[PDB]
């Protein structure tokens, strides 16, 4: 089934503002919440702009093609996909009213990007350079977070957040794979969000009690088979020879023993008492009493690691890895300065935390376990992204829509071009730009008008960046304020907006097959 | 579990004693073709009437005075005999060797096949 | 089982939307249409050719179009589109009335001298060019990357493509037409970069020989191709019965081994190092040859041998006796096992002709490159349609309205009831100039009666609307250009194309 030009750009632009507009507080402390419990058929919680789209299965292509590019910036900021989409349809809004006066399609989309670029240079020009600090990070982590969650659950979500890039920030990797590790625990409430510098261990062993308390932290993360295992196993394992099991029940526990004696020295090699605290980790499963002999001499012998964790345990600890225990010097583990062995709930989670050079921080947080314990992990997840970008540009300017019409000013106040026919693009593109804050402060509030002609000659009277209390529907100076856009968020996505935007206006029919 | 890989083991070892038992065989009743084949030139070479010494019975050896030279032996159907001209005895003697030869033949394919299977299954013992 | 006016229909109306969509498509400045796959997957293309598939097709003649569209597709596969809408522009036109005049006749014949008349214009229309100078082809090649809007690594593999394609341009009817290709060697290469990238001597091989034991490189060995017939013999010229025993083993594989021999002293007769044994490749052929230290490489294509026998420039010897430079690794050559990323690539350069590189790939990846490849494709290709045609012409409208004048002129002299084709010719130019003042978003007829006029006086020689520049302009001033033939090549297409149409009365199963 088809549709040709002008009906094949309507479907297209139609199709944008109800989807659009369920985002319309999807930014800022005013965004709401939105409950799939028909995505997949589950109930959920989310606010994102380019997630709630993959979460729904979302039926139309227009609804579809831009997740696809809305991937790009949730893959870069994480968050202004809970923005971008209102710009996109409402610059799509713009252009048809050429065209529904008439005017060529084509010119429309060519007098966007002169307009990309202008208001791009804008953002050269309005974009703040700031001197980051946890604070401004703070405020920068709240920023992103208000976007996701309450202000309140911002809060003590931001302490992790700038103090987790805070030692990645010393590592001075500008983006974070690492201090990402999080965790979520067995709590009536998700407000408990805890950080770690060190890591967190889900698995216990089998053995309680060995070292409950490991203070120093000797970490040879392992493979090891401390469990080969006890009685009849032939290379390990059963098999279709006697003639081997006969030979091969005897120097497993032997192997073992050995593995048990390669800690019980290493052990004594590490320590030489059970003060200092020293722990052992398998990656898979432990004979108890390998643990019980290991357990009495100050371990706390671990088994059945995940692979990753050994990561994180080798690094940020800067722990090791071998399959013989052996004996290894105290310090050829790596170390965390405390270990704390925690059960909440039935089992212990071990934090291994100031792991010695964290490379990973690790964020725990307690809650009912529900997606509201999701909703909270996501939120800050991607906030830590833009927060990550405030590390990556040193620009970082207020959020608010402060930026946006002081930037659709500009090419709204002199045709950028003095072109019509640019004008015809730009007057057309540079609009858009005034739907964030004009519809969250009528979200919040009084209609746009106001603070529009309020923020503009705000702006025009200062040319401090002042933005909207979000829940208001006033503008105040955004950059005090703290609602802030980094100039890596907000310029992509501007790019964004108006890359997708033309090839789709470009779209004159389409066919339903393939 | 255990037994089942010490079973077909040794198991594989006497398909080899067998097979290489019949090529051998298949061997031994091939020769004794050109026996029959052979002993037909030397009775044409010296003549019809020298004595001939064949055995009697266990441990008797019957002579006699050599006639029909032409006149051979093809033993053939179930039960039956045709003697055969001085030519014809030497073909099927050949023939019958030929009908032994890849029935013979393919016994080693057969033979040398079943022990390295033993040996896959002695393989997985030490294993 | 379809008839006659119906038919005619079915032909300017398929033809009609078959020559659409695609020139909201078309340009540089461009539209791309949307396709939805009945399960709701979508597809953005400026292609034509791809635009043509996940439709559903029924109309056999649209089919057919499909046919002379991949028939275009096989040899530019650029303007298949651009064919496609003149026979659609040719078939709406006259078609109808004419038929309705009763005739496709008048109609068949007129397009022979609508083709002349441009082919004559184009001759005038379009300008030779320097294959001789590759920047004066370049700019041609900058302009035939960008349509589809592909720079970034294509300006140099703009270059690269008329380095080796004049190169890999050695062929010779004795009125010397070069079509050659298959000489043009290419490289998927991890890392290196985009930007850089060559083309090597003879035909590099890349594809299927890694071959760690060609040894690594070859001074002055010979590569040895092999249509011997060099697989052994088992008895003194005859294979012998299998060894299904000790004997058949020692006096069989004793015979195996001279036929070996007495071709690869043969072989040695030419001296190689490198064997690239492709006919009578046997398991004691590369032994004895790997026995003679002579490194026998097996398993492999006589494609990578007919890519080295233009690797040599040279051909492959069933002659088993006497084997010989000329006959296989002409020239003195080279072969080179070499790591581009750390994949094993044979090189196999200095042909014995001239004109002797393969285009050497490296992108930042296989992937990145692939980009290069396959704009490079097109970049290389518009080389042998340079090196095919060095005449080349303005573009756009200045191509398109030139002829119809003449054309007019035509009609207006033949005054016939031909001249109603030439009058049906005349505007079917002018289409994709609407596409162009598409393409620039203006007004057609304007631009149309205003490029009218910049025919009228300039005679709209170099003077198209290019919507790229939105104006009518001098398209050499502006550098609009294209080799001749391919002007010609998308014209020649759509006249037989609305000719074959124009045939069809008939669709009968």
């Given at each position: 089934?088809v549709?040709?030009?002008?009906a094949?750009?309507?479907?297209?632009?139609?199709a944008?503002?109800?989807?659009?507009?369920?985002?319309?507080?999807?930014?800022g402390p005013k965004?709401?919440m939105?409950?799939?419990?028909?995505?997949?058929?589950?109930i959920?919680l989310?606010?994102?702009?380019?997630?709630?789209?993959h979460?729904?299965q979302?039926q139309?292509?227009?609804?579809?093609?831009i997740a696809?590019?809305?991937?790009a910036?949730?893959?870069?900021?994480?968050?202004?996909?809970?923005?971008?989409?209102l710009?996109?349809?409402?610059?799509?809004?713009q252009?048809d009213?050429?065209?529904?006066?008439?005017?060529?399609?084509?010119?429309?989309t060519?007098?966007?990007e002169?307009?990309?670029?202008?208001?791009?240079?804008?953002?050269?020009?309005?974009?703040?350079?700031?001197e980051?600090?946890?604070?401004?990070?703070?405020?920068?982590?709240?920023?992103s977070?208000?976007?996701?969650?309450?202000?309140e659950?911002?809060?003590?979500?931001?302490?992790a957040?700038?103090?987790?890039?805070?030692?990645?920030?010393?590592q001075?990797?500008?983006?974070?794979?690492?201090?990402?590790?999080?965790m979520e625990?067995?709590?009536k409430?998700?407000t408990?969000?805890?950080?770690?510098?060190?890591?967190?261990?889900?698995?216990?062993?089998?053995?309680?009690?060995?070292?409950?308390?490991?203070?120093?932290?000797?970490?040879?993360?392992c493979?090891?088979?401390?469990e080969?295992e006890?009685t009849?196993?032939?290379?390990?394992?059963?098999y279709?020879?006697?003639?081997?099991?006969?030979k091969?029940?005897?120097?497993?526990?032997?192997?073992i023993?050995?593995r048990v004696?390669?800690?019980?020295?290493?052990?004594?090699?590490?320590?030489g008492?059970?003060?200092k605290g020293?722990?052992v980790?398998?990656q898979?499963?432990?004979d108890?009493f390998?643990?019980?002999?290991l357990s009495?001499?100050g371990?706390?012998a671990?088994?059945?690691?995940?692979?990753?964790?050994?990561?994180?345990?080798?690094?940020?600890?800067?722990?090791?890895?071998?399959?013989?225990?052996?004996?290894?010097?105290?310090?050829?583990?790596?170390?965390?300065?405390?270990?704390?062995?925690?059960?909440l709930?039935?089992?212990?989670?071990?934090?291994?935390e100031?792991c010695?050079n964290?490379?990973?921080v690790?964020?725990?947080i307690?809650?009912?376990?529900?997606?509201?314990?999701?909703?909270?992990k996501?939120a800050?997840?991607?906030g830590?992204?833009?927060?990550?970008?405030?590390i990556?540009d040193?620009?970082?300017?207020?959020?608010?829509?402060?930026?946006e019409?002081?930037?659709?000013?500009?090419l709204?106040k002199?045709?950028?071009?003095?072109?019509?026919?640019a004008?015809?693009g730009?007057?057309?593109?540079?609009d858009?730009?005034?739907?964030?804050?004009?519809?969250?402060?009528?979200?919040?509030?009084?209609?746009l008008?106001?603070?529009?002609?309020?923020?503009?000659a705000?702006?025009?009277?200062?040319?401090?960046?002042?933005?909207?209390?979000?829940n208001?529907?006033?503008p105040?100076?955004?950059?005090?304020?703290?609602?802030?856009?980094?100039?890596?968020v907000?310029?992509?996505?501007l790019?964004?907006?108006?890359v997708?935007?033309t090839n789709?206006?470009?779209?004159?029919?389409?066919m339903?097959?393939? | 579990?255990?037994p089942?890989?010490?079973?077909?083991?040794?198991?594989?070892?006497?398909?080899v004693?067998?097979?290489?038992?019949?090529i051998?065989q298949?061997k031994?009743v091939?020769?004794?073709?050109?026996?029959?084949?052979?002993?037909?030139?030397v009775?044409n070479?010296?003549?019809?009437?020298?004595?001939?010494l064949?055995?009697?019975?266990?441990?008797?050896?019957v002579?006699?005075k050599?006639?029909?030279?032409?006149?051979?032996?093809i033993?053939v159907?179930?039960?039956?005999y045709?003697?055969?001209?001085?030519?014809?005895?030497?073909?099927?003697?050949?023939?019958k060797?030929?009908?032994?030869?890849?029935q013979?033949?393919?016994?080693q394919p057969?033979?040398?096949?079943?022990?390295?299977?033993?040996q896959?299954?002695?393989?997985?013992?030490?294993? | 089982?379809?008839?006659?006016?119906k038919?005619?229909?079915?032909?300017?109306?398929?033809?009609?939307?078959?020559?659409?969509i695609?020139?909201?498509?078309?340009?540089?400045?461009?539209?791309?249409?949307?396709?939805?796959?009945?399960?709701?997957?979508?597809?953005?293309?400026?292609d034509?050719?791809?635009?043509?598939?996940e439709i559903?097709?029924q109309?056999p003649?649209?089919?057919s179009?499909?046919?002379?569209?991949?028939?275009?597709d096989?040899?530019?596969?650029?303007?298949?589109?651009?064919?496609?809408?003149?026979?659609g522009?040719?078939?709406?036109?006259?078609?109808?009335?004419?038929?309705?005049?009763?005739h496709?006749?008048?109609?068949?014949?007129?397009?022979?001298?609508?083709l002349?008349?441009?082919?004559?214009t184009?001759?005038?229309?379009?300008?030779?060019?320097?294959?001789?100078?590759?920047?004066?082809?370049?700019?041609?090649?900058?302009?035939?990357?960008?349509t589809?809007?592909?720079?970034?690594?294509s300006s140099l593999?703009?270059?690269?493509?008329?380095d080796?394609?004049k190169?890999?341009?050695?062929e010779?009817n004795g009125?010397?037409?070069?079509?050659?290709?298959?000489?043009?060697?290419?490289?998927?290469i991890?890392?290196?970069?985009?930007?850089?990238?060559?083309?090597?001597?003879g035909?590099?091989?890349n594809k299927?020989?890694?071959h760690?034991?060609?040894?690594?490189?070859?001074?002055?060995?010979?590569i040895?191709?092999?249509?011997?017939?060099l697989?052994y013999?088992?008895?003194?010229?005859?294979?012998?019965?299998e060894?299904?025993?000790?004997?058949?083993?020692?006096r069989?594989?004793q015979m195996?081994?001279?036929?070996?021999?007495?071709?690869?002293?043969?072989?040695?007769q030419?001296?190689?190092?490198?064997?690239?044994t492709?006919?009578?490749?046997?398991?004691?052929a590369q032994?004895?040859?790997?026995?003679?230290?002579?490194?026998?490489?097996?398993?492999?294509?006589?494609?990578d041998?007919?890519?080295?026998?233009?690797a040599?420039?040279a051909?492959?010897?069933?002659?088993?006796?006497e084997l010989?430079?000329?006959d296989?690794?002409?020239?003195?050559?080279?072969?080179?096992?070499?790591?581009?990323?750390?994949?094993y690539?044979?090189?196999?350069?200095?042909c014995?002709?001239p004109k002797?590189?393969?285009?050497?790939?490296?992108?930042?990846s296989?992937?990145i490159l692939?980009?290069?490849?396959?704009?490079?494709?097109?970049?290389?290709?518009?080389?042998?349609?340079?090196?095919?045609?060095p005449?080349?012409?303005?573009?756009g409208?200045?191509?398109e309205?030139?002829?119809?004048?003449a054309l007019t002129?035509?009609?207006?002299?033949?005054?016939?009831?031909e001249?109603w084709?030439?009058?049906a010719?005349?505007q079917?130019?002018e289409?994709?100039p609407?596409?162009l003042?598409?393409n620039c978003?203006?007004?057609?007829?304007?631009?149309?009666?205003?490029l009218?006029?910049?025919?009228?006086?300039?005679?709209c020689?170099?003077?198209?609307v290019?919507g790229?520049?939105g104006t009518?302009?001098?398209?050499?001033?502006?550098?609009?250009?294209?080799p001749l033939?391919?002007?010609?090549?998308?014209?020649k297409?759509?006249?037989?194309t609305?000719?074959?149409?124009?045939?069809?009365?008939?669709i009968?199963?």
């Open positions: 089934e549709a040709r030009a002008q094949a750009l309507a479907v297209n632009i139609s944008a503002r109800g989807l659009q507009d369920v985002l319309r507080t999807n930014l965004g709401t939105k409950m799939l419990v028909s995505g997949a058929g589950d959920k989310t606010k994102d702009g380019n997630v709630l789209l979460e729904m979302i139309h292509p227009t609804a579809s093609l696809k590019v809305a991937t910036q949730d893959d870069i900021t994480g968050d202004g996909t809970t923005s971008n989409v710009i996109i349809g409402e610059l799509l809004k252009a009213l050429y065209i529904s006066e008439g005017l060529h399609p084509r010119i429309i060519e007098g966007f002169a307009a990309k670029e202008k208001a791009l240079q804008f953002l050269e020009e309005v974009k703040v350079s700031r980051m600090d946890r604070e401004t990070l703070i405020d920068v982590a709240r920023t977070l208000r976007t996701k969650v309450h202000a659950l911002a809060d003590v979500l931001t302490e957040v700038v103090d987790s890039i805070l030692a990645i920030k010393k001075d990797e500008p983006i974070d794979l690492f201090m990402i590790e999080i625990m067995k709590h409430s998700e408990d969000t805890s950080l770690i510098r060190g890591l967190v261990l889900d698995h216990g062993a089998r053995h309680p009690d060995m070292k409950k308390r490991v203070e120093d932290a000797y970490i040879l993360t493979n090891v088979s401390l080969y006890k009849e196993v032939n290379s390990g394992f059963f279709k020879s006697a003639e081997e099991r006969e091969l029940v005897k120097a497993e526990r032997k192997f023993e050995d004696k390669k800690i019980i020295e290493l052990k004594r090699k590490v320590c008492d059970s003060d020293f722990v980790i398998n898979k499963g432990i108890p390998s643990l019980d002999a009495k001499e371990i706390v671990l088994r059945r690691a995940k692979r990753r964790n050994m990561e994180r345990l080798t690094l940020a600890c800067g722990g090791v890895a071998l399959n013989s225990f052996d004996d290894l010097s105290p310090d050829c583990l790596g170390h965390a300065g405390l270990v704390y062995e925690y059960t709930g039935e089992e212990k989670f071990t934090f291994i100031k010695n964290p490379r990973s690790t964020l725990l307690k809650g009912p376990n529900k997606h509201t314990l999701t909703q909270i996501d800050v997840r991607d830590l992204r833009a927060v990550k970008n405030a990556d040193g620009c970082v300017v207020p959020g608010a829509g402060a930026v019409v002081a930037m659709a000013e500009a709204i002199h045709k950028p071009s003095v072109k019509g026919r004008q015809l730009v007057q057309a593109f540079a858009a730009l005034l739907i964030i804050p004009k519809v969250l402060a009528q979200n919040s509030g009084f209609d008008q106001e603070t529009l002609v309020k923020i503009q705000e702006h025009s009277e200062s040319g401090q960046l002042v933005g909207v209390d979000l208001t529907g006033e105040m100076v955004a950059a005090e304020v703290g609602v802030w856009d980094n100039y890596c907000k310029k992509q996505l790019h964004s907006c108006t997708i935007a789709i206006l470009l779209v004159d029919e389409i339903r097959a393939g | 579990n255990l089942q890989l010490e079973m077909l083991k040794n198991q594989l070892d006497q398909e004693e067998f097979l290489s038992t019949s051998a298949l031994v091939q020769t004794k073709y050109v026996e029959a084949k052979d002993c037909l030139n009775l070479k010296s003549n019809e009437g020298k004595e001939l064949v055995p009697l019975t266990s441990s008797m050896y002579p006699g050599l006639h029909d030279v032409e006149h051979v032996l033993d159907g179930t039960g039956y045709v003697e055969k001209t001085a030519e014809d005895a030497k073909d099927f003697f050949k023939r060797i030929d009908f032994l030869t890849k013979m033949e393919k016994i057969a033979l040398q096949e079943k022990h390295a299977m033993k896959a299954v002695m393989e997985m013992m030490s294993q | 089982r379809e008839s006659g006016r038919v005619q229909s079915g032909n300017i109306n398929a033809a009609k939307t078959i020559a659409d695609i020139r909201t498509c078309l340009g540089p400045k461009s539209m791309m249409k949307m396709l939805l796959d009945p399960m709701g997957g979508i597809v953005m293309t400026n034509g050719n791809a635009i043509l598939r559903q097709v109309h003649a649209a089919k179009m499909i046919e002379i569209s991949r028939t275009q096989e040899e530019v596969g650029d303007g298949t589109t651009s064919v496609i809408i003149l026979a522009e040719m078939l709406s036109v006259a078609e109808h009335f004419l038929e309705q005049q009763m496709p006749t008048v109609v068949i014949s007129a397009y022979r001298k609508a002349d008349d441009m082919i004559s184009l001759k005038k229309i379009s300008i030779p060019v320097d294959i001789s100078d590759s920047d004066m082809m370049l700019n041609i090649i900058n302009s035939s990357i960008t589809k809007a592909i720079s970034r690594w593999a703009c270059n690269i493509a008329l080796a394609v190169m890999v341009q050695f010779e009125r010397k037409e070069i079509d050659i290709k298959k000489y043009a060697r290419v490289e998927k991890p890392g290196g970069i985009i930007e850089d990238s060559c083309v090597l001597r035909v590099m091989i299927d020989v890694t760690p034991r060609m040894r690594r490189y070859i001074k002055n060995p010979r040895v191709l092999l249509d011997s017939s697989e013999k088992k008895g003194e010229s005859q294979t012998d019965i060894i299904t025993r000790e004997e058949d083993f020692t069989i594989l195996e081994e001279e036929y070996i021999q007495q071709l690869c002293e043969d072989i040695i030419l001296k190689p190092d490198v064997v690239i492709e006919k009578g490749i046997s398991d004691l032994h004895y040859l790997m026995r003679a230290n002579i490194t026998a490489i097996r398993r492999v294509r006589k494609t041998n007919n890519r080295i026998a233009r040599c420039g051909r492959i010897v069933s002659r088993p006796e010989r430079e000329d296989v690794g002409t020239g003195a050559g080279l072969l080179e096992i070499k790591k581009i990323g750390d994949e690539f044979t090189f196999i350069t200095d014995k002709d002797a590189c393969t285009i050497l790939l490296r992108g930042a296989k992937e692939s980009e290069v490849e396959r704009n490079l494709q097109d970049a290389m290709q518009v080389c042998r349609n340079v090196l095919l045609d005449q080349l012409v303005p573009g409208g200045a191509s309205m030139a002829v119809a004048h002129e035509k009609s207006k002299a033949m005054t016939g009831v001249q084709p030439y009058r010719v005349a079917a130019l289409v994709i609407r596409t003042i598409q978003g203006a007004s057609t007829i304007r631009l149309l009666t205003s009218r006029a910049k025919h009228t006086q300039e005679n020689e170099t003077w198209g290019n790229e520049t009518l302009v001098d398209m050499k001033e502006l550098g609009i250009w294209e033939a391919v002007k010609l090549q998308t014209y297409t759509a006249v037989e609305a000719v074959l149409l124009l045939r069809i009365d008939d009968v199963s």
